[PDB]
Design a protein around this ligand. Structure first.
Ligand SMILES: [Ca+2]
Ligand SMILES: [Ca+2]
Ligand SMILES: [Ca+2]
Ligand SMILES: [Ca+2]
Lengths: 229, 229
């Protein structure tokens, strides 16, 4: 179906649904909470999602956002993701689950209905992932189906970075382009039939999790979807 | 191979090669020529290319550019493309061939070695293409392998539009995202093994062609390629 929205900043959070530890702060979406000292709170997940659902049958979409990761140590955790899931999707487990999965089923593709592009700051040994920070495409599992190294210079840059996520409903391909100003660029594409995974309604939004020594902020976001009929 | 460059504008053309009707003008790449009164010259083609070759084996890349199409009537022709081809690839035929193909072999995939993202302002009946203006991915033929409607409001906007073109060398997927300020967004993706097509060296650049009542300008361009090992 057709849906579009545009937040040049988050001065207004009209039409955004928060769950968990996410909240509006300083015209951004702050995905995980900070204490009265400004220190990231450990073991917390949060979501900020566009409130109105849309349908993926016979649909392409384009979305872009800008983001900052604020780290306060060399060992930040855990990252964040932009994700698509059904509209009743709750906040799931904190830490390396990224607010998107639960321990007993996080690697079982038959037990989940969620697709994400993840920005992973913390190498987990509880499941298989790369031994370096990474950006990935996740399809119903915390074990990414496509993953690439995310350079530490970019992770720690304090830059306002940009992501572009598109889905071509004819070729059934999800793509992310991530760019840093005077830094790295990252490209990931994967064949997946989103309409088959999601035959009904879905929402799009962000999930962040700690972890420790990290807060994730979304500064701007826009989205459009169009019929491929 | 690894290659990066960045032209925030074309106050510098240091590494750009001009061929055919293309030239540096008004701090842009002007792909097809205009006469002394600024009127687009009919039946011309031009290329503006990054002068250094690179290789595609075990490579991903990301490139972005901004552009303007200046039209002087409601029937502009023919469009432009961003392309990859061998380093000796010349400016080819003007008109609907887009500076990329030869009339005798334009639909013969075995006879060409060129991949492009094309912005097509003129509906040709001489070969198969849509009955409306369109953006397309071309692989060794003027008949696009993946094509989508390009809205006339965007075609005629006079806006500085953006394109993002990436190639994921693991998944072998070429994607284009095209955006207009307060206008349409476009997403096209296609599975194609570029290293198989291009086992040696390539150069990337732009091809424009007239046609009539149209000039194509590239305002900025950046590129990065990285190894997938
Ligand atoms: Ca991961
Ligand atoms: Ca992790
Ligand atoms: Ca065409
Ligand atoms: Ca044409």
């Amino acid at each position: 179906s057709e849906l579009s929205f545009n937040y040049p900043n988050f001065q207004s959070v009209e039409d955004i649904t928060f769950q968990g530890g996410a909240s509006p702060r300083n015209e951004t979406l702050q995905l995980t909470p900070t204490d009265s000292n400004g220190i990231p709170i450990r073991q917390r997940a949060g979501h900020a999602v566009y409130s109105q659902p849309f349908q993926l049958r016979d649909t392409s979409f384009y979305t872009t956002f800008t983001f900052v990761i604020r780290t306060t140590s060399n060992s930040p955790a855990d990252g964040f993701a932009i994700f698509i899931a059904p509209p009743d999707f709750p906040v799931k487990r904190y830490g390396g689950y990224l607010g998107l999965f639960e321990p007993n089923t996080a690697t079982n593709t038959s037990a989940n209905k969620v697709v994400a592009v993840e920005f992973d700051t913390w190498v987990n040994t509880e499941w298989k992932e790369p031994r370096y920070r990474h950006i990935g495409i996740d399809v119903n599992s915390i074990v990414s189906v496509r993953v690439t190294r995310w350079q530490d210079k970019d992770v720690f840059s304090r830059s306002i970075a940009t992501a572009h996520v598109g889905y071509d409903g004819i070729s059934k391909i999800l793509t992310a382009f991530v760019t840093y100003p005077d830094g790295g660029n990252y490209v990931l594409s994967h064949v997946v039939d989103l309409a088959e995974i999601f035959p009904g309604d879905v929402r799009i939004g962000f999930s962040g999790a700690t972890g420790q020594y990290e807060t994730q902020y979304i500064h701007s976001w826009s989205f459009s979807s169009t019929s491929t009929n």
